[PDB]
């Protein structure tokens, strides 16, 4: 399955958002991060990627397709807008094994708020 996440200046949850900010996929699915607004990118957050994943960081304005192979929870940010809370979560598979690290990872306040809401939306 191939999914899309929009990078937006304004969305349902306010300014500087990924929509959807919460997504559950299967191993081998893809997610494309779409630069619907300019000025955004996607980057994995420190501490928020599972065993066997590779860190990643797109270029600003890049239409960025990730194939998710390693199971677990991924926290992503927009690099410039991380302090404004531009973040999202992708869960790959069921029963993610890296929740403790994910939940303990440090983040700016607005980021943490949105991450925690994304995680709760995933039933995590
Ligand atoms: Cu951004």
From Swiss-Prot:
GO molecular-function terms, A-Z: copper ion binding; electron transfer activity
The UniProt record lists the keyword Electron transport: yes
Keyword line: Copper, Electron transport, Metal-binding, Periplasm, Signal, Transport
Co-factor remark: Binds 1 copper ion per subunit.
Residues annotated to bind Cu cation: 40, 78, 81, 86
Cofactor dependency: Cu cation
Highest rank taxon of the organism: Bacteria
Primary location: periplasm
Residue ranges of every copy of the Plastocyanin-like domain listed in the record: 5-93
GO cellular component term, pick one: periplasmic space
Localization of this protein: Periplasm
Main function: This soluble electron transfer copper protein is required for the inactivation of copper-containing nitrite reductase in the presence of oxygen.
Listed name of the protein: Pseudoazurin
